[PDB]
Structures are given as structure tokens and as C-alpha cells.
Amino acid sequence: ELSFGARAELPRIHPVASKLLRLMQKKETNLCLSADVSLARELLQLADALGPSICMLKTHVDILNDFTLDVMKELITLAKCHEFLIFEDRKFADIGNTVKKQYEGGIFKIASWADLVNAHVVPGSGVVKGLQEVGLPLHRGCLLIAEMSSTGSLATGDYTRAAVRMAEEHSEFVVGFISGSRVSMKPEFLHLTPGVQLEYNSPQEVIGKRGSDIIIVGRGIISAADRLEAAEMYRKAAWEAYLSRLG
Amino acid sequence: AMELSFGARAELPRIHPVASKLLRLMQKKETNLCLSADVSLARELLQLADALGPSICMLKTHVDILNDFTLDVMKELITLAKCHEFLIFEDRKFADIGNTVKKQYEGGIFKIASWADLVNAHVVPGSGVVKGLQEVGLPLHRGCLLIAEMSSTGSLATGDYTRAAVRMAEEHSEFVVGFISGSRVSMKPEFLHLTPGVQLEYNSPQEVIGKRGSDIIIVGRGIISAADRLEAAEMYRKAAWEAYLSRLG
Numbered sequence: 001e002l003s004f005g006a007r008a009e010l011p012r013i014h015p016v017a018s019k020l021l022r023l024m025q026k027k028e029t030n031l032c033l034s035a036d037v038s039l040a041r042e043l044l045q046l047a048d049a050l051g052p053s054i055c056m057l058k059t060h061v062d063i064l065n066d067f068t069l070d071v072m073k074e075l076i077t078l079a080k081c082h083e084f085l086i087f088e089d090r091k092f093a094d095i096g097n098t099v100k101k102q103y104e105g106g107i108f109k110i111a112s113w114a115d116l117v118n119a120h121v122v123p124g125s126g127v128v129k130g131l132q133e134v135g136l137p138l139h140r141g142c143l144l145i146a147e148m149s150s151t152g153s154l155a156t157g158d159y160t161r162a163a164v165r166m167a168e169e170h171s172e173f174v175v176g177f178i179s180g181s182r183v184s185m186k187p188e189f190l191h192l193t194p195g196v197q198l199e200y201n202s203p204q205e206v207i208g209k210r211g212s213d214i215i216i217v218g219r220g221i222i223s224a225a226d227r228l229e230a231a232e233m234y235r236k237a238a239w240e241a242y243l244s245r246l247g
Numbered sequence: 248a249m250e251l252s253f254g255a256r257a258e259l260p261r262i263h264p265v266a267s268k269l270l271r272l273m274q275k276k277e278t279n280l281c282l283s284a285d286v287s288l289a290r291e292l293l294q295l296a297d298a299l300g301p302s303i304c305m306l307k308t309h310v311d312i313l314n315d316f317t318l319d320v321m322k323e324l325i326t327l328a329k330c331h332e333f334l335i336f337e338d339r340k341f342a343d344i345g346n347t348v349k350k351q352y353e354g355g356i357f358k359i360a361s362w363a364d365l366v367n368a369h370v371v372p373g374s375g376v377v378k379g380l381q382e383v384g385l386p387l388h389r390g391c392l393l394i395a396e397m398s399s400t401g402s403l404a405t406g407d408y409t410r411a412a413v414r415m416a417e418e419h420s421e422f423v424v425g426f427i428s429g430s431r432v433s434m435k436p437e438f439l440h441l442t443p444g445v446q447l448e449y450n451s452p453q454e455v456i457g458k459r460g461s462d463i464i465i466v467g468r469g470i471i472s473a474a475d476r477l478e479a480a481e482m483y484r485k486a487a488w489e490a491y492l493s494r495l496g
Contacts, residue, residue, distance in 0.1 A: 036347065038354060060343075062311075062357065063350040093340045093369055094309075095399055098285060101312040105287060107356060108311065120342055122371050122408075124401025150344055152373025154411055159371075159403055166401075 001246055002187055004030070004213075012188050016085070016115055016141035017175040020190065023083045024055045024214075030207065030242055031235045032056040032087065032192060034218030038063055040071040046227065047075055051082025053231040056116075058087045058216060061108050072113040079115075088114040091145065095126030104134045111138050118143040118178055121163045128166060132173045141175035146183045149195050182211035192216055196234075203234060207241035214238075250495050251436055253279070253462075261437050265334070265364055265390035266424040269439065272332045273304045273463075279456065279491055280484045281305035281336065281441060283467030287312055289320040295476065296324055300331025302480040305365075305441075307336045307465060310357050321362040334364040340394065341368040344375030353383040360387050367392040367427055370412045377415060381422040390424035395432045398444050431460035441465055445483075452483065456490035463487075 007013065008021035024030050033054045037043050043064065047057055057079065061067055079086050088110050092099055104111045111117075111134050119127045121144050131142055146163035148155045155163075164184050167174040176190030177183055180201075183191065193212040196203055197220050206212045215238045224230040256262065257270035273279050282303045286292050292313065296306055306328065310316055328335050337359050341348055353360045360366075360383050368376045370393050380391055395412035397404050404412075413433050416423040425439030426432055429450075432440065442461040445452060446469040455461045464487045473479040 038350065060347060060351065062355040063347065064355055067356050089343075091342045093342055094338075098309060098312065101287065102309065106311045106313060107316050120369065120371060122369060122403045123397055123399045124403065126399050126401070148372055150373045150375050152375070152411075152415075154371045154373065154408055156405075156407075158405075162401075162403055 003246060004242075007187050010188050012171065014141055014171070014175045014188070015139065017188065017190055020055060020085050027052070027055065027083060028239050029053060029055045029235050030214045030238045031231065032058055032214050032216045033221060033231065034058045034089075034194070034216050036060060036063070036218050036222060038065050040064060040066050040068075044071070044074055044078065046222070047078040048082070049228055050221070050231045051078055051084055053228065053235045054082075054084050055214060056085045056087050058089050059114075060089055061110065062090070067108070069109065069112075076113055085115040086113060087116040087118070087143070090117055092117060092119040092127055092131060093123055095123055095130050097130070099127060099130035100134050103131050111135065111140060114140065116141050116143060116175070118145055120145050121159070121166055125166050125169065128170050128174060132170065135173050140173070142170075142173050143176050143178050143190070143192060144174055145179075146177040147179040147181070149180055176213075179212065180210065190214060196220070198233065198237065203237040204241050207238050208244055211245070213242075248434065248436070252495060253491075256436050259437050261420070263390055263420070263422075263424045263437070264388065266437065266439055268364075269304060269334055276301070276304065276332065277488050278302055278304045278484045279463045279487045280480065281307050281463050281465040282470060282480065283307045283338075283443070283465050285309065285312070285467050285471060287314050289313060289315045289317075293320070293323055293327065295471070296327045297331070298477055299470070299480045300327055300333055302477070302484050303331075303333050305334045305336050305463065307338050308363070309339075310337055310359065311339070316357065318358060318361075325362055335362060336365040336367070336392070337363040339366055341366060341376055341380060342372055344372055344379050346379070348376055348379035349383050352380050360384065360389060363389070365390050365392060365424070367394055369394050370408070370415050374415050374419070377419045377423060381419060384422050389422070391419075391422050392425050392427050392439070392441065393423055394428075395426040396428040396430065398429050425462075428461065429455070429459065439463065445469070447482065447486065452486035453490045456487050457493050460494070462491075
């Protein structure tokens with residue numbers, strides 16, 4: 001198994017993945033914060049305070065009651081200052097011109113500020129092909145939702161295998177997966193895993209035993225009194241899990 | 248069973264109020280056409296809703312492609328919807344769960360639940376998506392459509408996926424009023440079936456409504472890209488309605 005830093009130098013690595021992997025190595029963080037807040041002040045305050053501890057800030061811009069593009073400009077400044085990527089967890093699922101406009105256009109103009117977005121694969125590769133039309137020109141990346149832990153989840157084996165093929169077939173845009181474990185043996189792909197809690201699975205299980213790269217964590221940090229301490233606890237846990245599996 | 252009329256179906260014991268309202272106006276107006284209003288400007292959305300409203304039972308929106316969205320725009324659409332008698336279906340294809348999906352439906356800038364009679368959802372995450380939506384949607388007297396089938400190339404809605412969608416709808420019948428599908432997926436007449444991918448020249452209204460047993464055609468560019476949108480709308484309405492009358496017996 002190769003280090004984040006070496007993976008960033010792989011021949012076939014996507015530029016956004018490379019950028020992500022470098023900063024994870026520099027900062028010793030594979031923690032993605034899920035910033036599930038409804039006010040812009042809260043979002044930016046968290047971004048600024050926890051920025052040093054994270055590789056990535058995951059947003060839902062569509063729950064921001066006071067969204068404006070200027071709010072996103074300020075978030076970008078923090079992302080640049082503190083060195084993290086912005087991932088809008090929009091879970092795109094439409095196709096064709098609809099999905100291109102949902103990514104590029106409307107009020108949110110997600111593509112203008114989101115380094116990464118994600119997509120569901122169930123509609124077939126039209127979802128990624130449509131996002132691509134926007135995303136390639138704008139030098140972005142995409143994550144495919146390959147597995148799901150939620151009760152009744154219908155991502156079968158075939159479903160998951162099909163996610164992985166679609167990513168491979170679209171490697172110029174798709175940079176990895178949202179998943180419960182390693183789903184692809186190609187080190188150019190990132191694996192991001194939600195449902196992580198210290199007390200759900202633990203960072204040790206997700207990164208150590210299941211082979212994922214990045215933990216996504218929301219309530220475990222956000223609902224805590226001291227968010228920085230919490231973020232740091234999660235960072236140290238996931239990073240050690242990572243160092244432990246390298247050799 | 249027997250093939251009941253839209254108007255009679257609206258009187259079924261177990262019919263959802265929104266589905267009843269929909270079926271009544273479908274019968275009253277002789278339309279089972281849903282316009283897909285895939286436009287990026289509020290003025291064109293409202294112009295089309297006003298002009299075509301008499302010919303449609305439903306207007307399907309993507310609020311998130313509207314470059315000049317405001318809630319006042321949606322207030323204006325509601326007035327048109329009331330005047331001409333059609334429902335508003337935001338095709339948001341919800342897929343998150345828990346408090347996220349609740350806030351995506353109730354909150355943010357769009358406040359979808361405040362104006363959308365109907366929304367839809369993907370079932371792939373499990374029943375969490377519906378359960379999350381229904382915490383908002385039930386109090387606000389709304390309905391939901393589950394995406395049970397897809398014709399798009401490489402779609403992964405297997406038989407099992409489709410049966411699971413039907414199951415989920417039956418287990419959440421206080422909120423779920425029907426399906427997005429290419430064909431009939433449930434034999435319960437309380438459930439609506441809406442079918443996209445329809446054009447006269449894809450499948451025709453005759454095939455979708457007449458042979459495959461779907462209730463409503465969803466039509467976008469076949470109307471929107473035409474010179475005379477009203478004529479096209481009327482063309483699709485007459486095709487879908489006649490296909491429906493032809494299957495009743």
C-alpha cells in the first residue's frame with residue numbers, strides 16, 4: 001500500500017485527487033468535516049476554526065437559509081488559506097441538460113466553487129456524462145456513491161461493481177467513491193466513508209480494517225461543545241489508522 | 248380487476264388527498280399530460296404555465312435550474328396553478344436521509360415544501376429518504392412519487408429494485424401517492440403512474456398510456472422546443488386522453 005503522498009504522484013492521478021492527496025500528507029489529515037448547518041456565519045466559523053484539521057469540507061448549500069454567492073467566495077478564501085477542498089454533497093441523479101444546469105447554473109452555481117461533487121449511479125452513466133460536460137472544462141472532480149449503509153439500501157454487489165466500472169470509464173472526471181470500504185484496487189481512486197463515530201463504525205475500522213482513505217464526520221464534531229478538540233480527536237484517530245496500514 | 252376512471256379512482260376509500268385532487272381535475276379537464284417546464288428563466292416558466300395551464304394536469308419544475316428564482320416567482324406559479332387547476336411537481340429526485348433531506352425539502356432558499364404539491368425521490372438509499380421527507384410532507388399535506396423504473400442507458404433499477412420501490416410506497420401510503428415509471432408497477436388503483444420519455448415521433452402516448460397502463464405522460468422538449476407550444480401541448484393532451492379512454496372498457 002502506497003502513501004497519500006506517493007499516490008498524488010501517480011501517472012494516471014486526476015489533478016484534483018493529487019491536490020487533495022498532497023494536502024492530506026502535508027497536514028496529516030484524512031478527515032472530511034460534514035458542515036451540516038443552516039446559517040452562513042456558522043459554516044464559515046467552522047471552516048476557519050477547523051480548516052487546519054481537515055482535508056475537505058462537505059457542504060449542503062441547499063440547506064443554507066442565507067446562501068449567496070459571496071458566502072461561497074469567503075469559503076473559498078478559507079479553503080485556500082487553510083488548504084482543504086470543498087465537496088458539495090448534492091448527490092446528483094438526473095441526466096442530460098438538466099443535470100448540467102443543476103451543476104453549472106441556477107442560483108447555486110455549484111461548479112463555480114465546489115472542487116468536488118457526488119453522484120448516484122442508478123440512472124446509468126448519463127449522470128456523470130452530463131456533469132462532465134460542465135466539470136471537465138472547469139477542472140473539477142466527481143465521486144460516485146458505490147455503497148450505502150442505510151437501512152434498506154439497495155446498492156447490491158452488481159450495483160457496486162457497476163459504480164466502479166463507471167468511474168474507471170470516466171477517470172478524467174471521476175476521482176473516487178463514497179463507500180463503506182475499499183471498492184476499487186486502483187490507488188488513483190479515493191474512498192470516502194460516512195457514518196463514522198468514535199463511540200456507524202469507528203475511524204479505526206473504516207480506515208484500518210476496511211481500507212478507506214477519508215472519514216466523513218458531522219454530528220460527532222458539530223454537536224460537540226468544543227469542535228476543534230473533537231475535530232482533532234477524529235483527525236488523530238483516522239491518521240493513525242492510515243499510518244498503521246501502510247508498512 | 249376493473250379499469251376505473253380517473254374520477255372514480257379519486258373516490259377510492261384509501262386515496263391520498265393530493266392524488267384525489269389530481270384525479271378530479273384530470274377528469275374535469277380531460278388532460279393527463281404533465282408539462283416538463285425545463286426553462287432557466289422565471290418569465291418563460293410563468294408564461295408557459297399560464298398559456299398551457301388549461302391543457303395540463305401537472306407542471307413539472309426544476310427550481311434549481313432557475314437563474315432568477317425567488318419565492319415570489321413560486322407565489323406567482325401557485326396563482327396560475329390555482330386558476331388553471333394543475334398541480335406543481337418539483338422533480339428534485341431527493342436521495343439523502345434524516346435531517347438533511349428534511350431541510351432540503353422544507354428549508355434553504357427554495358423552501359420546496361411551501362409550494363410543491365408533489366416531489367419525487369430515489370429509493371436506492373432505503374426508506375430513510377421517504378421517512379425524512381414525510382416528517383415535513385405529512386404535516387404540510389403533500390405527496391411523493393418514488394422513481395421505480397428508469398429507461399436511461401445503463402439504468403440499474405432491476406426487477407428487485409422496482410419491487411422494493413413498490414413495497415416502500417405501500418408501506419408509506421399516507422405520503423407516497425405513486426411512481427415515476429415506464430409502465431404499471433402496482434395493481435393498486437390508488438397509486439398514480441407518471442411516465443417520462445414521451446414523444447409523438449422514447450415511446451408514444453399510445454404505447455405509454457394505452458398499452459403500458461401508465462396514467463400520466465411527462466413531456467418536455469416535444470412541447471417546449473416547438474414553435475406553437477399550445478398546439479403541441481394540445482396534440483399531446485388529445486393523444487394521452489384518447490389512449491386513456493381506449494383502455495377503460
